[PDB]
Nucleic acid binder design. Structure first.
Length: 155
RNA sequence: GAACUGAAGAGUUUGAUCAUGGCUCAGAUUGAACGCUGGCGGCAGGCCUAACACAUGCAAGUCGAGCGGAUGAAGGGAGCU
């Protein structure tokens, strides 16, 4: 029941005494499609081995994002290493308006109605980190009331 | 009651990477022009340049119930008929 999406497949290389060796790196994002999400990387000599190594690595590193329900709660901005990302909640109906690098993350994480924009560098590995940090730091209203020691009357 | 609901990125420096950084593209539009093609209708638009020169025809006339003269009928009377 885990929906898996491929963000990118990249061909990296290193040089040795005589010629070069080719390695394929793939980064994928996994999640239940409602409340769970996880991303991982994997390097292997071949693409069928490469995309697979990312699979277990993604499923082993997942969190619990606290969505408002079919959408995100509050407009937030998250950054990780010269990759700035802004995401804003949207009303029912509008699709996933986000870059293809992060569009997989929101769509897999269960978000279906959101407005997002990438600022700064658009490296797919780093933007995935940025949106992940924003989604992880997401706070539902009852949690904020617990921090301030009040009811949901703070709204 | 409504006058708002709104934001995508990609390619390209390297053996390969991250960043910075420029270039190019995917969009909307036009009083548009060119090429290929071409059935109709509604609505609209149509010298953006030489405020260059203009043939031709019209685009500012009207009032006789303001005024003077001319043209001077209908209708009647006469030579001839």
């Amino acid at each position: 029941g885990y929906i898996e999406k491929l963000v990118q497949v990249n061909r990296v290389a290193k040089t040795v005494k005589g010629g070069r060796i080719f390695a394929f790196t793939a980064l994928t994002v996994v999640g239940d499609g409602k409340g769970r999400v996880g991303f991982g990387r994997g390097k292997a000599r071949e693409v069928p081995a490469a995309i697979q190594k990312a699979m277990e690595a993604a499923r082993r590193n997942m969190i619990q994002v606290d969505l408002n329900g079919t959408t995100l709660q509050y407009p937030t901005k998250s950054a990780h290493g010269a990759s700035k990302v802004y995401m804003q909640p949207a009303s029912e109906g509008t699709g996933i308006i986000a870059g293809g690098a992060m569009r997989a993350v929101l769509e897999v994480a269960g978000v279906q109605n959101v407005l997002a924009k990438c600022y700064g560098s658009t490296n797919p590995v780093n933007v995935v980190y940025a949106t992940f940090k924003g989604l992880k730091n997401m706070q539902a209203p009852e949690a904020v009331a617990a921090k301030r020691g009040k009811s949901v009357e703070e709204i």
